[PDB]
């Protein structure tokens, strides 16, 4: 379910630490 930064995410609201799913993962929040 919830993931961190470099965790393959679908959207930016699925990572626990409000980040941005840009490079196929959460990174440039």
DSSP 1-29: --B-SSS--SSTTSBSS---B-SSSB---
Experimental method: NMR
Output the CA torsion sign for 16, 4, 15, 1: negative
Domain limits, the chain = 1-29
Euclidean distance between CA atoms 23 and 7, whole angstroms = 11
CA of 21: how far to CAs of 1, 2, 28, in Å? 14, 12, 8
Question: For residues 19 and 12, is the Cβ–Cβ distance under 8 A?
Answer: yes
Six token digits for residue 1: 């379910």
Q: How distant is the alpha carbon of residue 4 from its chain centre? A: 6
Euclidean distance between CA atoms 23 and 13, whole angstroms = 15
CA of 28: how far to CAs of 5, 7, 13, 18, in Å? 9, 13, 13, 10
Q: Which residue has the tokens 């440039």?
A: 28
């Amino acid at each position: 379910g919830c993931k961190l930064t470099f965790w393959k995410c679908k959207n930016k609201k699925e990572c626990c630490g409000w980040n941005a799913c840009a490079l196929g993962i959460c990174m440039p929040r």
